[PDB]
């Protein structure tokens, strides 16, 4: 699935 990078 699509992603938007690492988060906290």
């Amino acid at each position, epitope marked *: *699935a*699509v*992603g*938007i*990078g*690492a*988060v*906290f």
Partner: antibody, heavy 122, light 108 residues
Framework: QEVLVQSGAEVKKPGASVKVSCKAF????????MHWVRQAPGQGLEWMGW????????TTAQKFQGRVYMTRDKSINTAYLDVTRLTSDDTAIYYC???????????????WGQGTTVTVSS | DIQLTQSPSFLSASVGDRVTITCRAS??????LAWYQQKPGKAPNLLIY???TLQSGVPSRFSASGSGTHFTLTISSLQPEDFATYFC?????????FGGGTKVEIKR
């Protein structure tokens, strides 16, 4: 309680801009990407983009690139949607919605704001 | 873009009926699909993710199946609180899109 609280209704003229806010309560704001989805009266749902609240990185739908800007303010747990160059076709209810984001990929929109009505008219 | 086609667009049903709603994707999307319920004046509510996993708090009379292109949401025994509109949504590539919705209303 995990809730998203959006700003109030807006009425705008064609060519103007609107900035909708979405404030997160009850969980760590920077832990989940935030989607923006709109719904014109009587119609279905249209995805506009999403933002990573940690990095501030955005992926904006191609339909809206160049005139819609997603930003965030970590200090007040708030995501913003700036929709510029409005026309009547932007009349809709605008929602923010958090993604579960398991494995750092989109999974599903599990918490939604109450919506912000935007009317664009001369 | 990927188009999700829902069927039917409108359904009239009675309390206690089994309701079956389909979503067809124009391209394979694996299990990267969610289902939502929406009532007038309210935001959608997540029912299903990973095409078949029930979201926490959702009544177990909701279930769903599918992987690939053809997905099915089933309400085993329809209750008054279930009359609403239902949407599928993929997250396989950009842009994310939703199906057109299925409005479930009361038969009389």
């Amino acid at each position: 309680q995990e809730v998203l609280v959006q700003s109030g209704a807006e009425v705008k003229k064609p060519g103007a801009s609107v900035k909708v806010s979405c404030k997160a309560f009850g969980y760590t704001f920077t832990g989940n990407p935030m989607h923006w989805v709109r719904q014109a009266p009587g119609q279905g749902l249209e995805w506009m983009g999403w933002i990573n609240p940690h990095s501030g990185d955005t992926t904006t739908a191609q339909k809206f690139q160049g005139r819609v800007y997603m930003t965030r303010d970590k200090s007040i747990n708030t995501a913003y949607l700036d929709v510029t160059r409005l026309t009547s076709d932007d009349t809709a209810i605008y929602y923010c919605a958090r993604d579960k984001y398991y494995g750092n990929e989109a999974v599903g929109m599990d918490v939604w704001g109450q919506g912000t009505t935007v009317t664009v008219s001369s | 873009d990927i188009q999700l086609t829902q069927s039917p667009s409108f359904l009239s049903a009675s309390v206690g009926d089994r309701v079956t709603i389909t979503c067809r994707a124009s391209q394979g999307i694996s299990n990267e699909l969610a289902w939502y319920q929406q009532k007038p004046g309210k935001a959608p509510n997540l029912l299903i993710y990973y095409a078949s996993t029930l979201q926490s708090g959702v009544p177990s009379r909701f279930s769903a199946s599918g992987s690939g292109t053809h997905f099915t949401l089933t309400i085993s025994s329809l209750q008054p609180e279930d009359f609403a509109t239902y949407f599928c949504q993929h997250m396989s590539s950009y842009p994310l899109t939703f199906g057109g919705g299925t409005k479930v209303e009361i038969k009389r």
